[PDB]
Structure formats: C-alpha cells, structure tokens
C-alpha cells in the first residue's frame, strides 16, 4: 500500500515517502510486484460516481446542460485551496528586490540611513526564501492530483458512454479518432492544472509591482508597462494564430492513425500482396501536410516564447531613460529598477499567455468531450413476457437513414422448439433481418415482438483476448456439466487437447494463434453456452469442412437444443430438409414463406545518435555556438574601453538571447528530424519478419505511433531550443562574472556538480519507471479497441458491467503507475530545492556578516535551477527518441515464370523457432499447366502450407519452379510469381480504384471490365460514387458476399503464371458460385491453381489432390480414389 494513507502531516508536507522506492530502485531493477498499491482516493469506481451523480442531475435539471457546471461541483474548493496557497507562495517573489534594495542602502559609503541593521536583514532575506519553498510544491503536488484524478473521472465517463452508441452514429465514429482524443489530453491535461492559476495571479502581481516601482522612478514606471502591454497585445494575437493551425491538423492525424493501423492489423496480407512499397507513399503523402502545418505553427510558438529573452533591455531603457532625462540616476537604484524589472517581464510575458492557452485548451477538450457524451443512443424497449414465440409483421427498414430499402414487407411467426431457416442469395439481407430482431436496427415501420433473452453467434468470428476458458464462459458462472457437454458436442475436444496448457491458453486479440476454423467453433460454442430464450445463429458452419458441419448440425442444433427456438442462416438443402419453416429472401423481399414440402410443390547513446541522423542538424548547432562565442568574445575583451560592468551583466539575457537567425533554422531542423525517424520507422516496420512483427500486439502500435511521434512533432523542437538557451545564458554569464570576482565563482563549481551528481542518481530510478507508465498506459487502448470491435456482440449477450469492470481495473493500474513518478519527481525537484538554499544560506550570509554582487549571484543561482528543470524535461522527453530507435532496430527478413511447375524438397514450416513443427519432411511435385487441389480436415495445416510457400514463416526446405531455387533470387522478386487469396480479406480506407489497385497501373475501363466480369457492376453502382466511393470503417459498407468478389476481381486483375488460392468462396451461395467458376475457367486457362476449398460440388476441376494429416501429405491422382479409403468423406 501507498504510505500516503498512513503519513504525517509533516512527512507529507516533506514528501519524504519516496525515499524506499528511490533507495531500491537506484540500485536494482523496479519490477511491478514491487510498485507502491493504490489509495482508494484515485479508485475509478469511485472516481466516475462521484462525477456521474453530478452530470445526470445537471441533465436532467438544466436546458442547456454544461459538462464544466458538473467538474465544477466536485473539484472547485480543493482547486481554490491550491490557488490561495500558490498566490502565498508567489507573493514573496515580488518582495526580493525589496529586501536587496533596503540592503544595498545599508551597505553604502560613510553611513547611510540605516547601520546597524544589515543583520536583521541578511538572515531574513535568505529565510524568506525557506517560506517559499514549502508554500510553493506541495500547491503544485495538490493541483497535479486534482487534474489526474479529472482526467481518469472523464476517462471512466467516455467508456461508459461508448457502449449505448447506435448502429448508426458508429458510421461517423473510426478507432483512430477516439485513439487521437485520448492521446492529446492523456498527460498534458494534469499538467497544466498548476498553469490555470496565473490569470488571476498575474494582474495582483503587475499591480504589486507597479506600485512598489512607483516609489522608485515617480511616473517613469508606466513607459515600461505600455511597452509590455503592448508585447503582451502581440503574443495574445500570437496565439489565436497559433490555434488555426492546431485545430486543421487533427483530421490527417486520424486519417493517418487509422490508415497506419488498418495495415498493422493485418501486415500478413500486405506482405502476401507485396504491397509495402505502394502503402508507404501513402502515408507519406499524408504526412507531407501535417509536417507543413506543423512547422507553420512552430515558428508562431517559437516567437511566442521568445519574447521574454527579447524584452529586458527595451522595458529597463524606458523604464530608467525618462527619469534620467530629468534627475539623473543612482547606482542603488538602477539595481532595484532591474530586480523588480525581471519579475514583471517573467508575469506578463510568459506567466499569462500560458495561463490563457491552458484555459483555451482545457475548456475546448472538455466541449468536445460533452459533444462526444450527448450523442444518439441505443434503445431495447421490448417486453419482458410473452407467450414464448417470436412475431413480426409489415418491417420496412433503411441501413442509411435517407435510399432503396433493405428489407420490405417480411412477415414471419414461430412458436416455442422451431427451427426457422432463412436463405438467400448474396445481398439479399439476412444478416440485416438478424440485426432487426436484434434491435441494432430500426425499423421504419412495423412492430417485432419477442423476450428479451437472445443469443448471437456472429458470421466474423469474435475472440476477445483471453483464455479459452474465459473465452467460452463470457463472464457468467462456470459449470462442469454444461461446460464438457458443450466443449464436447462443438468438436473441441483434440484442438483444445493439443495445446499444453489445457483448457486456459492464452489468445491475443483476434485469436491470431487459433486458425480460421477454430476461431468459429469457439464462436458457436459461447453462443451455445448461454442460457437464452432464442438462439439466432448467422451462417455458424462458414469456415467448417462438411464432414465437419454434418457433425455438428445434428448433434448441436437438432440434438443438444432441440427445444428452444433458434433462428438459423441456411445456404444447403440438408438444413432445409430437417427445418420447420423456411424464408427466402432475394433483393430484401419475402419470395417464400413456409415448409419445405410445399416449397417442393411449389416448383548518453541516445542524444548522440538523435543528433547524427540529420547532417543540418550539426552544421546548425555549429552556428548557433560559434555565435554565442563571438557575442560572449565581444563582452570580455572589449571591456578595455570601460574599465559598472555589473549593469552590463545584468541584461545578459536580452545580450546572449537567440534571435530569429540561429533559432528559425534550429527549430525547422528539429522537424526534418522527426520526419526521417518516422519514415525509417515505418519502413522498417513493414520490411520486418512475420516471427518479430507477431510480438508486437494492436496496444503496442498505437502508443508508438499516435502518442510517441507526436511528442517529437510538437514538444521536443521548443523544449530542447529553450533548455539550450538556458545553458547558453549561464555559460556567457559565468565566464564573465568569472573574471571581476573570482571569488564568487568558486561557490557555483560544487553547486553544479551537485546538480549533475543528484540528478544522475535521480535519473537510475525515472528512467524505468516513466518508461513502465508509459507502456503501462497500452491495455486501456487495446482493450478500448476490442470493446469497440466486439459491440454488436456485446449488447446481444447482455455482459455490459463486465467488461465496465474490466476496464476499471486497466484504469487503476495505469494510475497506480502513474502516481509514484508523479510523486518521485516532486520529492527530487524538492531536494533540488532544498540543496539550493542549504547553499544558498551561506553565499550572502557569510560574505554579509559589495553590496550589489549579491543581486547577481541570486540573478544567476535561479537561471542555474530553471536550466535545471529544462535539462530534466529534456531528459524525460527524450525517452519517446529512445523506444522510436528500439523501434527502428529490428531484424529484415529480405520471362522467368513460364510455365509454373513446381518442386518441394524437405519443407518443414514452424511458426516459431523450436515450436511444433506443422509440417515435417514435406515433398511432392507438380507438372505444370495442372489444377492442384488441397483437402483435409480442419487444423491440419493447409494455411501453413500455402504461407511456408511465400516463405512468410521461417522454412527449411528449398522449392524451385522452372529450374531456379529459393536462394538464386531475392524474396521480394520471388514473392511476385504467386497471386495469393488470402482467407482474411483485407480492406483499407479509401476508394474502390485504390482499393482494387493501390499502384495505379490499370485504367478505368480495364477495371470495369474485370468489375463486370466478377459481378461487382450492380454492387459498385448502387453508391453515390461509382469507383469513387470512400469505403470507411474497414468496408462495412459493403457484405460477406461481396467481400470475397472483390478479392477475387483483385486476383483476377493482377496476372501471376502461379496463384494460391485459399478458400475463394467463403460464403457464396450457389448461384453466385457459378460466377466463381465462369471466372476461375476463363481467366485461369494456363496457371496452375492451387484450390482450398472446402465445397465438394467445386472439389471435381481439379486433377491432382493433396491430402494434408498427420503433419504429412500424400498425393493421389484420380477424383474417386481418394474417396474410397475413408468412407466417412463419402458419406457425409
Ligand atoms: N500465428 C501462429 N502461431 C503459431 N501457431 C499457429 C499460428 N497460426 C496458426 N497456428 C497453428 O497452425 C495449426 C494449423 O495450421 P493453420 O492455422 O494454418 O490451420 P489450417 O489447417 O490451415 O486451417 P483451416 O483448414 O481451418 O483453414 C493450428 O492448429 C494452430 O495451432
Ligand atoms: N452498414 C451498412 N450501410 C449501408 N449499406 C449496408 C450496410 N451493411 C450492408 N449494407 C448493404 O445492404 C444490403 C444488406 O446486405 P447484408 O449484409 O444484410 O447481406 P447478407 O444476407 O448478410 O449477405 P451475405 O451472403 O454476404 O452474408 C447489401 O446490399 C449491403 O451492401
Ligand atoms: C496587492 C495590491 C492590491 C495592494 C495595493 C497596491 C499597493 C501595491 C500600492 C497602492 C498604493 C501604494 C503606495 C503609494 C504611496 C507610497 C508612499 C511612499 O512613501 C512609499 C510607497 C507607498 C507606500 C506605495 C507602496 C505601494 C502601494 C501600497
Ligand atoms: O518563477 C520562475 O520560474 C522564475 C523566476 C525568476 C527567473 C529569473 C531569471 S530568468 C533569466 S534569463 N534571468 C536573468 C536575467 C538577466 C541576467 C541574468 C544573468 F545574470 F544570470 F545572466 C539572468 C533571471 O533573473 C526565472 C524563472
Ligand atoms: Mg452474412
Ligand atoms: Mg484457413
């Protein structure tokens, strides 16, 4: 547990908790077991209830409901506790040139006003000092707690929200902006809770200033504040400028984010497609835009912030010139003028700006978060009794809300204990009945009427990532009888048998280890497992052999639940024959309606290799020092003429500030840089072997795209120009005072080494646990993404809470990481603090016990501890540069064909090193211009065959067509003979035209032609634009049936003397299949295919036959003798 629970107040206020963690973690390895619990202040469940109440009382009591009047409510007293505490804290920073200026006149020649006094004050000066510091952290600590725990309630109230969203608001919804919307305000919202205070401490402050300069300079002191007024009118009209640019460059960041992880998703295709050099550009080209309007907007910024390092000359000449004019000035004085001078300039030109910005971004991401929560929802309204019978009348309805309906005019009625089986050819709409039944979908007109209870299984397989246990259960309570009798009745007992950890493996999201006709049995058997009234099954057997779907048929559907209705989505005549009533639609439209009898009669080394990967880079960094050296050269050597050289010292920072001739080039080099480390990333990324890309999981891409290149874009540039800055105006400013007092010099060495000592043994411990938050902040995505690919799902079965508490758990742990750095670097900037006044109590103290030095040794002891800060968050930022060159350093796997015969010679294929090995000794040989077809039962390993061809898995084996082996030529020329179909079609955003060809190498009409060819002339026409259309959400726009008719037309388009086809028609109808086979004679007369598919009717073209079993394939020759050894082919 936290210490925080059971502290002192004195303990808390010192922060001293960190100590154990800091001692074990400098020194040995911080491992999560080992990490500080979580208090149950920070608790989601609690977090979200406290901010819920709130928001539904202020929607239902207001008209205009305010998400900020319900933040309000909760975090406003604690938030003004911390403000009253900062404006304490900060109310003594303007009262130090006082007490230097009352010091210096004690100190004056031959007795001045006061004499026996400098002892009052010397002590106290420096005591003040020690009020600041513990009025100042812990308000800082308090207001970073307060927007973390903001930040999670909203988090917590964002997931509540996305489960109730509709069919049809999920059409404008991608998972690349929700992604984007989390990674802005993931951790710069917390942060700049500190900030938000300075727009009302800033105006105390100016008017506290300008009255005690007032009693300096009479009416002088208001030339200076027109000046910085009128900067601070520039930088206000700075920033609007700055946020044109902000808000046009969130739409490619989200067209790119989704882009970037449709093509992660499933690389496997790409690879197979050799598509990586055509889908490079694309995001290239994408890319292009947002780096121009980024570095617009990094200039605008740039001036921004360099308008305090520009301003402490011109605010002191109009400040002391005026009165000078008039009554000259004294070397007492024109001090003062300048302390108090530096206050002002640091309040209005870079306290108040950020304040506002803070204030902008904060109230516009919580707008956008309201504008996120009041959206259209999801209604259920149906009653909970009935006589156990399902009843529908008259339902019209429309997928988009304007268009030709989907369904017209379907009326059906089933008692309790039947069967109703619904089929039809592609299109026509089953899947959308099934969603109507299932509420999805609205009917325009009409009334369906049934209990609540439904059960779904899905024609897309869904596996939530889990054990298979888990998988099963779906978060209801276990069972031992019901359980084995469904896992043996589903055909799952050698698949499950197979892995070593029995029953509870571990699958990732989207079952990636389980093959395609697994993932299905698994489907249908959670669909199996729960107890409800109606079992609506859409199209279960789709990826099953007919050995396979016979078996299952009669012994899960008519022997297991022979007694409860179940709706069924039926292409064969077997069902048909066993059904109880049957449905046919065609074009959404009820063609028959009743029973099969009469349907019968009816017819460190990080920085240095950041630096390195961009030339300008060096040659820039050269010119902005070797300037700083002739400006440090003209103020050191030039002083022959002079010698008063402390007031030259005192506006160093406007002598050694950086204009717009060595800061522009720097900033627009910072980017170029970021450029080239994401497009060597990205490039290594898709050029990575299949056996390191599977490590990589769907959280782990979208906290190193979205987030970790978004920092280089937009922090690092500003952050590294300022710290360098800082650097730069300590160096010239040390050497120089160096030189007339060497004395003072001396206490700065031990000082900084120090700093450099503390801040290295800080570093062993924040360098392991930011990057464990920071890979720690990976399960919410990935488990926001599966929620949000399995919400159709989701509703259906009813197991809303549980996954509401699966994400309460994600949410406490990225907490519980987050808080111990969040706390660790408050006790490390403290002690940084606390070393500066331990050495600090004795520079003025002992020289006191001339009197100007000691302005510039606290002039430059606090330029000292900024540098400080900076180089810290330099530090931290850089982590991001670290995991993109981890990122970047991974292993690269990198007329001839004639007539297509091919050769294997001992072919093993393991998906992993050291594996089991899926096929062992493989050979066999094909004569070439011969139709090939695979067979074998699921599980066997025809997918692995069809990869260990392309080589995408490790091999040991050498196959050769015409006479060249495997090693004469290169992967990426070898991988273009075959033209592959792969089981899970891939589908991007974009057009159709880019879609059927990312390349752009056919013309409109030699696409049409294929299109028409196909059939997809009344699919791609029925859309407002023709080849133009903008398939979006992964092509949801279009069907099952259609899917495999583009992929197939996509394989027709591209012409390969050798092609792979796996399983060309997954859910094709009859009908349509004669298109398949109208295509697969006409377009493939003189390549040797290589079938996969499972229908027996399609399993007759084919000439030679390979039976894969026993991790070994034996090869016959005629059609019936393979069909003659086992009998249970024949007969089912
Ligand atoms: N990414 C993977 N890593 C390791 N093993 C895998 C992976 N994908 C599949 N397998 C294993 O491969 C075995 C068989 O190979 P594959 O997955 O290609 O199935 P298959 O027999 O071709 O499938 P089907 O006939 O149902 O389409 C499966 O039992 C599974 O354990
Ligand atoms: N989200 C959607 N928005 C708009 N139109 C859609 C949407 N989903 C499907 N459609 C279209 O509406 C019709 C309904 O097709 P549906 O997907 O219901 O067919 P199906 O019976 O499931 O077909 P299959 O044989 O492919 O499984 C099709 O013309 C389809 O292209
Ligand atoms: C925090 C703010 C609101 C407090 C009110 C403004 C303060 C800073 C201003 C208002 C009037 C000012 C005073 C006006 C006149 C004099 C007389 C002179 O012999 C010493 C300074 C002194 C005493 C000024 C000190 C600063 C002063 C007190
Ligand atoms: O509250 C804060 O964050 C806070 C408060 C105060 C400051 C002070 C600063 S910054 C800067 S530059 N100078 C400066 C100016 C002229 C000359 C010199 C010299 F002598 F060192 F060269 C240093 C300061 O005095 C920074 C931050
Ligand atoms: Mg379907
Ligand atoms: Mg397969």
């Given at each position: 547990?936290?210490?925080?629970?059971?502290?002192?107040?004195?303990?808390?206020?010192?922060?001293?908790?960190?100590?154990?963690?800091?001692?074990?973690?400098?020194?040995?390895?911080?491992?999560?077991?080992?990490?500080?619990?979580?208090?149950?202040?920070?608790?989601?469940?609690?977090?979200?209830?406290?901010?819920?109440?709130?928001?539904?009382?202020?929607?239902?009591?207001?008209?205009?409901?305010?998400?900020?009047?319900?933040?309000?409510?909760?975090?406003?007293?604690?938030?003004?506790?911390?403000?009253?505490?900062?404006?304490?804290?900060?109310?003594?920073?303007?009262?130090?040139?006082?007490?230097?200026?009352?010091?210096?006149?004690?100190?004056?020649?031959?007795?001045?006003?006061?004499?026996?006094?400098?002892?009052?004050?010397?002590?106290?000066?420096?005591?003040?000092?020690?009020?600041?510091?513990?009025?100042?952290?812990?308000?800082?600590?308090?207001?970073?707690?307060?927007?973390?725990?903001?930040?999670?309630?909203?988090?917590?109230?964002?997931?509540?929200?996305?489960?109730?969203?509709?069919?049809?608001?999920?059409?404008?919804?991608?998972?690349?902006?929700?992604?984007?919307?989390?990674?802005?305000?993931?951790?710069?919202?917390?942060?700049?809770?500190?900030?938000?205070?300075?727009?009302?401490?800033?105006?105390?402050?100016?008017?506290?200033?300008?009255?005690?300069?007032?009693?300096?300079?009479?009416?002088?002191?208001?030339?200076?504040?027109?000046?910085?007024?009128?900067?601070?009118?520039?930088?206000?009209?700075?920033?609007?400028?700055?946020?044109?640019?902000?808000?046009?460059?969130?739409?490619?960041?989200?067209?790119?984010?989704?882009?970037?992880?449709?093509?992660?998703?499933?690389?496997?295709?790409?690879?197979?497609?050799?598509?990586?050099?055509?889908?490079?550009?694309?995001?290239?080209?994408?890319?292009?835009?947002?780096?121009?309007?980024?570095?617009?907007?990094?200039?605008?910024?740039?001036?921004?912030?360099?308008?305090?390092?520009?301003?402490?000359?011109?605010?002191?000449?109009?400040?002391?010139?005026?009165?000078?004019?008039?009554?000259?000035?004294?070397?007492?004085?024109?001090?003062?003028?300048?302390?108090?001078?530096?206050?002002?300039?640091?309040?209005?030109?870079?306290?108040?700006?950020?304040?506002?910005?803070?204030?902008?971004?904060?109230?516009?991401?919580?707008?956008?978060?309201?504008?996120?929560?009041?959206?259209?929802?999801?209604?259920?309204?149906?009653?909970?009794?009935?006589?156990?019978?399902?009843?529908?009348?008259?339902?019209?309805?429309?997928?988009?809300?304007?268009?030709?309906?989907?369904?017209?005019?379907?009326?059906?009625?089933?008692?309790?204990?039947?069967?109703?089986?619904?089929?039809?050819?592609?299109?026509?709409?089953?899947?959308?009945?099934?969603?109507?039944?299932?509420?999805?979908?609205?009917?325009?007109?009409?009334?369906?009427?049934?209990?609540?209870?439904?059960?779904?299984?899905?024609?897309?397989?869904?596996?939530?990532?889990?054990?298979?246990?888990?998988?099963?259960?779906?978060?209801?309570?276990?069972?031992?009888?019901?359980?084995?009798?469904?896992?043996?009745?589903?055909?799952?007992?050698?698949?499950?048998?197979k892995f070593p950890e029995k029953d509870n493996t571990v699958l990732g999201e989207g079952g990636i280890t389980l093959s395609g006709g697994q993932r299905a049995k698994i489907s249908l058997a959670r669909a199996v497992y729960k107890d409800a009234d109606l079992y609506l099954l859409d199209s279960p057997f789709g990826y099953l052999d007919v050995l396979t779907e016979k078996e299952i048929f009669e012994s899960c559907v008519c022997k297991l639940m022979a007694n409860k209705t179940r709706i069924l989505v039926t292409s064969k005549m077997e069902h048909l024959k066993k059904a109880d009533k049957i449905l046919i639609l065609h074009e959404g439209s009820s063609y028959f309606y009743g029973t099969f009898s009469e349907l019968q009669n009816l017819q460190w080394n990080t920085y240095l290799r950041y630096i390195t990967v961009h030339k300008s880079l060096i040659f820039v960094l050269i010119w902005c020092l070797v300037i700083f050296l002739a400006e440090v050269a003209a103020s050191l050597v030039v002083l022959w003429l002079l010698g008063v050289f402390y007031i030259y010292v005192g506006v160093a920072d406007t002598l050694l500030a950086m204009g717009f001739f060595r800061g522009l080039p720097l900033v627009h080099t910072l980017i170029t840089v970021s450029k080239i480390l994401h497009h060597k990333m990205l490039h290594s990324v898709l050029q990575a072997p299949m056996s390191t890309l599977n490590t990589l999981k769907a959280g782990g891409i979208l906290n190193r795209f979205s987030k970790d290149i978004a920092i280089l874009d937009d922090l690092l540039p500003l952050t590294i120009f300022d710290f360098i800055q800082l650097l730069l105006i300590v160096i010239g400013a040390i050497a120089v005072v160096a030189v007339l007092q060497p004395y003072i010099f001396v206490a700065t060495v031990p000082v900084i080494v120090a700093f450099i000592m503390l801040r290295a043994y800080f570093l062993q411990t924040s360098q392991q646990l930011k990057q464990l938050e920071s890979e720690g902040r990976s399960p919410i995505?990935?488990?926001?993404?599966?929620?949000?690919?399995?919400?159709?799902?989701?509703?259906?079965?009813?197991?809303?809470?549980?996954?509401?508490?699966?994400?309460?758990?994600?949410?406490?742990?990225?907490?519980?990481?987050?808080?111990?750095?969040?706390?660790?670097?408050?006790?490390?900037?403290?002690?940084?603090?606390?070393?500066?006044?331990?050495?600090?109590?004795?520079?003025?103290?002992?020289?006191?016990?001339?009197?100007?030095?000691?302005?510039?040794?606290?002039?430059?002891?606090?330029?000292?501890?900024?540098?400080?800060?900076?180089?810290?968050?330099?530090?931290?930022?850089?982590?991001?540069?670290?995991?993109?060159?981890?990122?970047?350093?991974?292993?690269?796997?990198?007329?001839?064909?004639?007539?297509?015969?091919?050769?294997?010679?001992?072919?093993?294929?393991?998906?992993?090193?050291?594996?089991?090995?899926?096929?062992?000794?493989?050979?066999?040989?094909?004569?070439?211009?011969?139709?090939?077809?695979?067979?074998?039962?699921?599980?066997?390993?025809?997918?692995?065959?069809?990869?260990?061809?392309?080589?995408?898995?490790?091999?040991?084996?050498?196959?050769?067509?015409?006479?060249?082996?495997?090693?004469?030529?290169?992967?990426?020329?070898?991988?273009?003979?075959?033209?592959?179909?792969?089981?899970?079609?891939?589908?991007?955003?974009?057009?159709?035209?880019?879609?059927?060809?990312?390349?752009?190498?056919?013309?409109?009409?030699?696409?049409?032609?294929?299109?028409?060819?196909?059939?997809?002339?009344?699919?791609?026409?029925?859309?407002?634009?023709?080849?133009?259309?903008?398939?979006?959400?992964?092509?949801?726009?279009?069907?099952?049936?259609?899917?495999?008719?583009?992929?197939?037309?996509?394989?027709?388009?591209?012409?390969?003397?050798?092609?792979?086809?796996?399983?060309?028609?997954?859910?094709?109808?009859?009908?349509?299949?004669?298109?398949?086979?109208?295509?697969?004679?006409?377009?493939?007369?003189?390549?040797?295919?290589?079938?996969?598919?499972?229908?027996?009717?399609?399993?007759?073209?084919?000439?030679?036959?390979?039976?894969?079993?026993?991790?070994?394939?034996?090869?016959?020759?005629?059609?019936?003798?393979?069909?003659?050894?086992?009998?249970?082919?024949?007969?089912?």
């Amino acid at each position: 547990r936290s210490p925080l629970e059971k502290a002192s107040v004195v303990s808390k206020l010192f922060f001293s908790w960190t100590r154990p963690i800091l001692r074990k973690g400098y020194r040995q390895r911080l491992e999560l077991s080992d990490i500080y619990q979580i208090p149950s202040v920070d608790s989601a469940d609690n977090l979200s209830e406290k901010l819920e109440r709130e928001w539904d009382r202020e929607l239902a009591s207001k008209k205009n409901p305010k998400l900020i009047n319900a933040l309000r409510r909760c975090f406003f007293w604690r938030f003004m506790f911390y403000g009253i505490f900062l404006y304490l804290g900060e109310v003594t920073k303007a009262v130090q040139p006082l007490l230097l200026g009352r010091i210096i006149a004690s100190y004056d020649p031959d007795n001045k006003e006061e004499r026996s006094i400098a002892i009052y004050l010397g002590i106290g000066l420096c005591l003040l000092f020690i009020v600041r510091t513990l009025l100042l952290h812990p308000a800082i600590f308090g207001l970073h707690h307060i927007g973390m725990q903001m930040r999670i309630a909203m988090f917590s109230l964002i997931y509540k929200k996305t489960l109730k969203l509709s069919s049809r608001v999920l059409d404008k919804i991608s998972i690349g902006q929700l992604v984007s919307l989390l990674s802005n305000n993931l951790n710069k919202f917390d942060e700049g809770l500190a900030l938000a205070h300075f727009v009302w401490i800033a105006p105390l402050q100016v008017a506290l200033l300008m009255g005690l300069i007032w009693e300096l300079l009479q009416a002088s002191a208001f030339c200076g504040l027109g000046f910085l007024i009128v900067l601070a009118l520039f930088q206000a009209g700075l920033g609007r400028m700055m946020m044109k640019y902000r808000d046009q460059r969130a739409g490619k960041i989200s067209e790119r984010l989704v882009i970037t992880s449709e093509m992660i998703e499933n690389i496997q295709s790409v690879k197979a497609y050799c598509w990586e050099e055509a889908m490079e550009k694309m995001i290239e080209n994408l890319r292009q835009t947002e780096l121009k309007l980024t570095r617009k907007a990094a200039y605008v910024r740039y001036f921004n912030s360099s308008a305090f390092f520009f301003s402490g000359f011109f605010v002191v000449f109009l400040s002391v010139l005026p009165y000078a004019l008039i009554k000259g000035i004294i070397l007492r004085k024109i001090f003062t003028t300048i302390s108090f001078c530096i206050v002002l300039r640091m309040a209005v030109t870079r306290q108040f700006p950020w304040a506002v910005q803070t204030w902008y971004d904060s109230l516009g991401a919580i707008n956008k978060i309201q504008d996120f929560l009041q959206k259209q929802e999801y209604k259920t309204l149906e009653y909970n009794l009935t006589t156990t019978e399902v009843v529908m009348e008259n339902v019209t309805a429309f997928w988009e809300e304007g268009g030709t309906p989907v369904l017209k005019d379907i009326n059906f009625k089933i008692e309790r204990g039947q069967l109703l089986a619904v089929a039809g050819s592609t299109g026509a709409g089953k899947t959308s009945l099934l969603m109507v039944i299932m509420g999805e979908l609205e009917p325009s007109e009409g009334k369906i009427k049934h209990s609540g209870r439904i059960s779904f299984c899905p024609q897309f397989p869904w596996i939530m990532p889990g054990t298979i246990k888990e998988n099963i259960i779906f978060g209801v309570s276990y069972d031992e009888y019901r359980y084995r009798s469904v896992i043996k009745a589903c055909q799952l007992e050698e698949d499950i048998s197979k892995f070593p950890e029995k029953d509870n493996t571990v699958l990732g999201e989207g079952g990636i280890t389980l093959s395609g006709g697994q993932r299905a049995k698994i489907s249908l058997a959670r669909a199996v497992y729960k107890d409800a009234d109606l079992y609506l099954l859409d199209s279960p057997f789709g990826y099953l052999d007919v050995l396979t779907e016979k078996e299952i048929f009669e012994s899960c559907v008519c022997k297991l639940m022979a007694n409860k209705t179940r709706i069924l989505v039926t292409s064969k005549m077997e069902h048909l024959k066993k059904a109880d009533k049957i449905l046919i639609l065609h074009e959404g439209s009820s063609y028959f309606y009743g029973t099969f009898s009469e349907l019968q009669n009816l017819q460190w080394n990080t920085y240095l290799r950041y630096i390195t990967v961009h030339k300008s880079l060096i040659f820039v960094l050269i010119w902005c020092l070797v300037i700083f050296l002739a400006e440090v050269a003209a103020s050191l050597v030039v002083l022959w003429l002079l010698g008063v050289f402390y007031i030259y010292v005192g506006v160093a920072d406007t002598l050694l500030a950086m204009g717009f001739f060595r800061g522009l080039p720097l900033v627009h080099t910072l980017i170029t840089v970021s450029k080239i480390l994401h497009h060597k990333m990205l490039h290594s990324v898709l050029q990575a072997p299949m056996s390191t890309l599977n490590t990589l999981k769907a959280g782990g891409i979208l906290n190193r795209f979205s987030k970790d290149i978004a920092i280089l874009d937009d922090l690092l540039p500003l952050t590294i120009f300022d710290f360098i800055q800082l650097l730069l105006i300590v160096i010239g400013a040390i050497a120089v005072v160096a030189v007339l007092q060497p004395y003072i010099f001396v206490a700065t060495v031990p000082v900084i080494v120090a700093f450099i000592m503390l801040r290295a043994y800080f570093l062993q411990t924040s360098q392991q646990l930011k990057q464990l938050e920071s890979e720690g902040r990976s399960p919410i995505f990935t488990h926001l993404v599966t929620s949000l690919k399995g919400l159709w799902t989701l509703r259906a079965f009813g197991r809303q809470p549980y996954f509401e508490t699966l994400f309460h758990k994600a949410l406490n742990l990225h907490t519980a990481n987050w808080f111990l750095y969040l706390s660790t670097l408050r006790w490390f900037q403290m002690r940084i603090e606390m070393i500066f006044v331990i050495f600090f109590i004795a520079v003025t103290f002992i020289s006191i016990l001339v009197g100007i030095i000691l302005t510039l040794a606290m002039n430059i002891m606090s330029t000292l501890q900024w540098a400080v800060n900076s180089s810290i968050d330099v530090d931290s930022l850089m982590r991001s540069v670290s995991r993109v060159f981890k990122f970047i350093d991974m292993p690269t796997e990198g007329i001839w064909p004639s007539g297509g015969q091919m050769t294997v010679k001992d072919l093993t294929a393991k998906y992993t090193e050291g594996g089991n090995a899926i096929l062992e000794n493989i050979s066999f040989s094909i004569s070439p211009g011969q139709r090939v077809g695979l067979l074998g039962r699921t599980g066997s390993g025809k997918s692995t065959l069809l990869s260990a061809f392309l080589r995408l898995l490790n091999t040991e084996g050498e196959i050769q067509i015409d006479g060249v082996s495997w090693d004469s030529i290169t992967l990426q020329q070898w991988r273009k003979a075959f033209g592959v179909i792969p089981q899970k079609v891939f589908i991007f955003s974009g057009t159709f035209r880019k879609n059927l060809d990312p390349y752009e190498q056919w013309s409109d009409q030699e696409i049409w032609k294929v299109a028409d060819e196909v059939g997809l002339r009344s699919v791609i026409e029925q859309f407002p634009g023709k080849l133009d259309f903008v398939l979006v959400d992964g092509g949801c726009v279009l069907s099952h049936g259609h899917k495999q008719l583009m992929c197939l037309a996509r394989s027709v388009l591209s012409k390969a003397k050798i092609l792979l086809l796996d399983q060309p028609s997954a859910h094709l109808d009859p009908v349509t299949y004669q298109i398949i086979r109208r295509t697969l004679k006409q377009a493939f007369a003189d390549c040797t295919v290589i079938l996969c598919e499972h229908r027996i009717e399609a399993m007759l073209e084919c000439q030679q036959f390979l039976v894969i079993e026993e991790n070994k394939v034996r090869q016959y020759d005629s059609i019936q003798k393979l069909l003659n050894e086992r009998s249970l082919f024949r007969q089912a």
